[PDB]
Design a protein around this ligand. Structure first.
Ligand SMILES: Nc1ncnc2c1ncn2[C@@H]1O[C@H](COP(=O)(O)OP(=O)(O)OP(=O)(O)O)[C@@H](O)[C@H]1O
Ligand SMILES: Nc1ncnc2c1ncn2[C@@H]1O[C@H](COP(=O)(O)OP(=O)(O)OP(=O)(O)O)[C@@H](O)[C@H]1O
Ligand SMILES: Nc1ncnc2c1ncn2[C@@H]1O[C@H](COP(=O)(O)OP(=O)(O)OP(=O)(O)O)[C@@H](O)[C@H]1O
Ligand SMILES: Nc1ncnc2c1ncn2[C@@H]1O[C@H](COP(=O)(O)OP(=O)(O)OP(=O)(O)O)[C@@H](O)[C@H]1O
Ligand SMILES: Nc1ncnc2c1ncn2[C@@H]1O[C@H](COP(=O)(O)OP(=O)(O)OP(=O)(O)O)[C@@H](O)[C@H]1O
Ligand SMILES: Nc1ncnc2c1ncn2[C@@H]1O[C@H](COP(=O)(O)OP(=O)(O)OP(=O)(O)O)[C@@H](O)[C@H]1O
Ligand code: MOO
Ligand code: MOO
Ligand code: MOO
Ligand code: MOO
Lengths: 245, 268, 245, 245, 268, 245
């Protein structure tokens, strides 16, 4: 049978780095929404990296550095977004916690307080996999690996778009981009073309043990994160191909 | 192709974008420690056997480091299997078992490190890496624990809760990351055979084989962790590895001298 | 007069490594018993090492290593048992905490949550005492040193046997082994022959300042740990020779 | 406009090292007063260094060491006073927390428990400013930098004197020493002569963003700290020259 | 003046006491690393520019460290400005922005460190300092992040939330603390001019100037963080600094050889 | 000696009924201020009656009813204001509690939650004192009787005016009305003319045992209640003539 759930009452929320990149205009409403959710859910909030990681990839690739050097450089930017978000929630008892604390002491920290913030990037560091010059295991992938290892009640991915489209809705082909309210990880994995989630997220969904669905929602629209944490369908649902016990 | 084209894509496209991915592939390729060799010392196949296996290898390491720069990683072995058994029986997930196994590789690095301390060779960690550059420069060798750092973020295997990336993968990925010139797995068999030589009496020795040939022969999961074979086919810097018997006196030395002892496994 | 009690409301429970070595068959009932005790007591749960430490002693002694090298190697195994036990209790808010946190921040952690798990081995490390090739200050000894330094309400040692007998009840002489419901540390110290507790435990009991008695009980019998924490006599009581204030 | 307040409900209390230097006679009543305050306020209690830092300055200056070597040596003594004070409050759930925890996880720790103790010295360390051979950024200065960065409700400085006088009331000129119930940081900065607070405290008050007043009170008089935390005037008030929003 | 007089004052007077302060000023003055040079490699002016700026400087560092002991600190650059912009827009205080900026300087030290690792040069930290004495002794150079450690305890500027003590100040204070013989800021301009040469077309180059003269000329906040000028006037050990163009091949080498390239700024 | 303090860490806040009478325009900012104070103080918030009590006095006096009939009729209106204020704070865990719960179970309720709301009117009911046809023991008086009986840290009276003036600042003589930043209860008691506080408040201040000062502040000015609870002088201070122990 499947492994037990370590924290079955946990909700994991991953905040895209590009949401953070919009500054106060996006962050202040999101902080106010998170504030209202604290009495409703036990939250692990994990931040991605955003545009600064693109800059350090540009410099690092120009210097020739390998993918295991670029992975911790990008992870740094996700940690900085986590410190910013936690500071905004400090008066509610929320702090940023480091990766070892997440891996080993999350239960005591969520007993102390209603939510903690950490980095969504996983600590693959210099042991990132080779093949692409871009680190594959990024923020979407790390947040899902954690949520599934914990057996959490859900993972919600909060982005600057409504969900997944058939083409980049901010890209060259944005005119033929059609919104997908629902999809499976296996169908996405067989498509080519860009996605708002790591391609490695689809691979770890194939070996998942607990989480059956992950919703991608627009954090720039107040109320969508709240609705998603109640299971309401307000973005794109990704079916992992976990099947019930 | 140009720096500015790559920077524009990096700013304007998802990292998932095939066009970005392809411009990133054309970037220059810097090797961090190109003159170093990574050696894995097996946990079950060497360190668990005690003095009779470890002391001759310590002597080889000490002799080798005069002419060779060495990063010596340790395996885990029977105490990790015991931990895996306990934890799997409780239903714990692969990410928890991954943390448990690292502690056994750490134990083995500490024991090997204490036998090498009087020769100046440190166990590294703490600093992680940057104790490595100074030690390699001055003393030509360092000892490290071979388990990857993934811990709770370990991807699980398709079936079961045993962490699929263990100390063969950890040592391999470090060689690949540093762009080292050579990767040697030190085990307790002469090399790869057509069957497990401990189980099968008429297995045939294989001096050289590619990953694809190994898969076509049913040898995906034999003398190396099978994910290592896929990592090898993806690698940028380390495109072959050598498996040698650490229980044969001088085998490590001879492998470092370019002798074809053991089995060479090629990415293609 | 004697030193103050730092945490007079604390109960310390040491879990033998060989209990953990039995796997789910022993661990699951013990976890269920611990779960029920969390609302009754403030617990510091400390794990011993068990058989894996015997294996690393075999390898380390075969390599010639001194007792200060073997001590942290065994301590590692007690930490691993602590991570396993804490994982099973994570959904109750229980986490493993490192030795510095135990020594300096136990009060805040037991304010956050009902119980924490740590290693019972003390951090003697490369400064372990010479004389035996086997590290003397092990899990029973470390747990008692901690409980007494804190001035805790009790220390209960949870083993795979009913208590102390006149001979090893799993050993060659097991036929003449007689159960001892009560004994003193000074009488045990004058005996030769094996015990289910560290001999150094008897030495630190002689210099103890607060804890008057320590009960050894069978953790493989559901309900004995619960009864021992209420002071019921269900195993072997060891009198430390602390005398009342 | 001014920066937000991170922890607007926080009260910061700095305990002079020389209060701690008096031993149980001063510490026990202060601990009993702190115990009674825990249900009234959310406290960050920060200890100074006292006479041991004078000794290590004497040795360090005799060895020729520069001001960036002396600064962490003095900070050590403030950390030791913090460990002593926290031990006395352990049974109330109070622990000492390290500087990184104060800077990054204070919110979760004050959610776990009513008060934490840390070092008042700031981590300037080998990057202390040159000019004086005595480290300028000491315990008063660090505590104020923290309280103001957090936007705390107050900072109260607890000393072994009633407040600020016109001369050292334990010094040669103590006969002409007149008590000052109220003063401004700018007026003190223009005076020469010794003070019971760091001169660098007056400089950081000039750039402060939130805290308008800081009270210096006698911790050797039971009840004064309690009264000061309610805003009662029982020592010397220092006006920072923050002006209201 | 005597040891006993100083000890008596240290025991009996507040550290604020002018008489104590004056006896402390007469103490002996030990330089910890008097033969070392601190070099700051600019974040925006060098590392952000990639290979064309960094690779020639790596080559100079490698050549220089044969005859010179070097402590090489990194700046932060455009990613820190982005973080400052986000955080300032949220109303966060200078002490929070200080922590964010340090992570960017750490990134830059890691990238520079990886290009130098094969020459034995480590990135230090972890140990803080005492990896420094051993590395300097053996390999003649170390890389460090240039941001001061003040973090949440950063004093704010008179106006605004940008941390006033950044990587120019961090590197300067380390040179001053260690009593180093020389402090070189590596930027992307030949030196100080009468106006910003990127904004003004007829600015005039200044080979040598004191802090007071700079203030009298409106140049308090130009090519160096302006608090550094005040730190320099207070310094015990480093009483002048040199600003050179790292984009000119050999400029660092020539500055280490005593050539007057660039601008020398004196405390008095 | 004087009686002990039952709840020495309690802050009592009395909200004038006429503040409530202004509706959302006054209530919403006050609720937002109270929300921010909940993590800083343990609050007993007590509401007065306002204009509806004037209406029921008009009807009751027209029917001839005695003062002991009018007293519970007015108290009803203060209870209604308390239910309204508590509803607005419900999502913060705040509820209205009845007079018996205040008198007997306040400690457990302030352990459950950060603040509770009750009626400020005391339960004199049909045993109100005769003499005036207007019930004398009203909301200011009841709140002070409670705060002083508990030995609370303070009582703050939140009104629709800045404090006490020499004449009604909304009345006929408002042109000669001078603001009084500070006064004593004994001096007010000797004056004739209207006040913003019950005259019986001055009488119970004369027999008080603990509370030395009570501040009257303008609840229509955001931030004044917050400042008053820190002891800042932002309205009229009334000295009770309790003198220190
Ligand atoms: N098919 C697609 N559907 C939706 N968005 C897409 C698609 N292809 C590309 N994208 C892009 O993905 C962007 C979001 O993913 P991106 O990695 O850029 O940011 P992020 O998730 O905030 O970053 P991080 O991974 O650091 O958290 C969107 O703004 C959108 O333009
Ligand atoms: N086809 C094969 N050829 C050679 N050896 C094989 C083959 N198939 C299986 N093996 C077994 O694999 C073993 C080597 O892998 P093993 O995991 O034992 O080494 P290790 O590196 O010591 O592991 P660890 O370090 O994880 O303890 C050999 O002892 C051998 O019995
Ligand atoms: N006189 C005795 N009475 C009872 N048990 C004894 C005696 N002498 C030896 N023992 C043995 O002690 C064993 C338990 O102690 P042991 O050190 O082996 O395990 P543990 O306490 O679980 O390990 P750890 O110290 O790592 O926690 C028992 O199973 C028993 O066989
Ligand atoms: N003008 C002054 N008014 C009041 N006290 C003064 C004055 N000048 C000097 N002092 C001295 O300052 C002393 C307290 O400051 P000091 O630095 O000595 O101790 P502290 O604050 O306890 O130490 P730390 O800064 O390590 O916490 C007083 O005991 C007093 O003698
Ligand atoms: N009077 C001046 N003379 C020369 N340069 C000036 C002057 N005034 C301003 N500057 C500017 O200062 C810049 C150097 O400082 P800058 O902060 O860019 O360097 P940096 O050390 O790379 O910063 P960081 O490391 O913080 O990124 C030059 O590019 C120049 O445009
Ligand atoms: N001397 C005075 N100074 C200040 N206000 C006065 C004075 N005399 C009369 N008042 C009036 O007192 C009013 C407030 O007291 P009032 O009893 O009317 O309301 P309240 O306290 O809100 O009611 P309740 O007692 O039901 O809580 C003010 O609006 C003001 O007009
Ligand atoms: O990071 Mo913590 O580990 O709030 O006791
Ligand atoms: O120190 Mo912890 O290990 O704030 O839960
Ligand atoms: O960080 Mo602590 O120091 O989870 O109580
Ligand atoms: O029933 Mo009580 O008597 O909600 O504390």
């Amino acid at each position: 049978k499947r492994p037990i759930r370590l924290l079955p009452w946990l909700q994991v929320v991953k905040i895209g780095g590009r949401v953070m990149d919009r500054g106060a205009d996006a962050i202040l409403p999101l902080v106010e929404e998170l504030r209202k959710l604290l009495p409703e859910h036990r939250l692990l909030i994990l931040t991605g990296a955003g545009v600064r990681a693109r800059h350090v990839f540009s410099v690092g690739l120009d210097l020739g550095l390998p993918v295991g050097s670029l992975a911790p450089l990008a992870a740094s930017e996700a940690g900085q977004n986590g410190h910013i978000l936690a500071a905004m929630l400090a008066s509610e008892g929320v702090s940023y916690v480091e990766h070892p604390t997440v891996a080993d002491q999350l239960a005591i920290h969520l007993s102390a307080t209603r939510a903690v913030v950490g980095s969504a990037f996983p600590p693959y560091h210099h042991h990132e996999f080779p093949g692409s010059r871009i680190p594959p295991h990024r923020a979407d992938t790390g947040a899902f690996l954690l949520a599934d290892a914990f057996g959490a009640a859900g993972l919600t991915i909060v982005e600057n778009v409504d969900g997944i489209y058939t083409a980049d809705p901010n890209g060259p082909d944005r005119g033929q981009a059609r919104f997908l309210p629902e999809t499976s990880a296996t169908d996405l994995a067989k498509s080519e073309g860009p996605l708002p989630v790591d391609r490695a997220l689809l691979d770890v969904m194939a070996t998942a043990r607990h989480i059956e669905r992950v919703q991608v929602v627009n954090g720039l629209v107040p109320g969508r994160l709240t609705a998603a944490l109640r299971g309401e369908h307000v973005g794109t649902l990704i079916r992992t191909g976990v099947r019930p016990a | 192709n140009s720096t500015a084209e790559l920077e524009e894509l990096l700013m304007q496209r998802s990292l998932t974008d095939p066009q970005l991915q392809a411009a990133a592939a054309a970037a220059a390729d810097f090797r961090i420690l190109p003159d170093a060799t990574v050696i894995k010392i097996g946990g079950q196949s060497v360190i668990d056997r005690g003095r009779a296996a470890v002391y001759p290898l310590v002597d080889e390491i000490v002799a080798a480091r005069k002419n060779h720069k060495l990063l010596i990683g340790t395996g885990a072995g029977t105490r990790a299997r015991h931990l895996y058994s306990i934890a799997a029986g409780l239903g714990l997930p692969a990410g928890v078992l991954a943390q448990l196994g690292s502690s056994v590789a750490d134990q083995n690095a500490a024991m090997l490190g204490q036998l090498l301390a009087k020769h100046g060779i440190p166990v590294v960690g703490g600093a992680g890496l940057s104790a490595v550059p100074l030690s390699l420069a001055e003393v030509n060798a360092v000892v490290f624990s071979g388990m990857p750092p993934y811990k709770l973020w370990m991807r699980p295997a398709a079936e079961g809760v045993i962490p699929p990336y263990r100390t063969d993968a950890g040592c391999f990925l470090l060689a690949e990351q540093f762009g080292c010139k050579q990767m040697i797995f030190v085990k307790d068999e002469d090399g790869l055979y057509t069957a497990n030589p401990k189980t099968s009496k008429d297995a045939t020795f294989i001096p050289r084989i590619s990953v694809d040939e190994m898969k076509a022969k049913g040898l995906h999961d034999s003398i190396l962790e099978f994910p290592v074979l896929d990592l090898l086919q993806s690698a940028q810097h380390v495109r072959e590895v050598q498996v040698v018997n650490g229980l044969v006196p001088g085998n490590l030395t001879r492998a470092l001298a370019g002798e074809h002892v053991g089995t060479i496994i090629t990415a293609s």
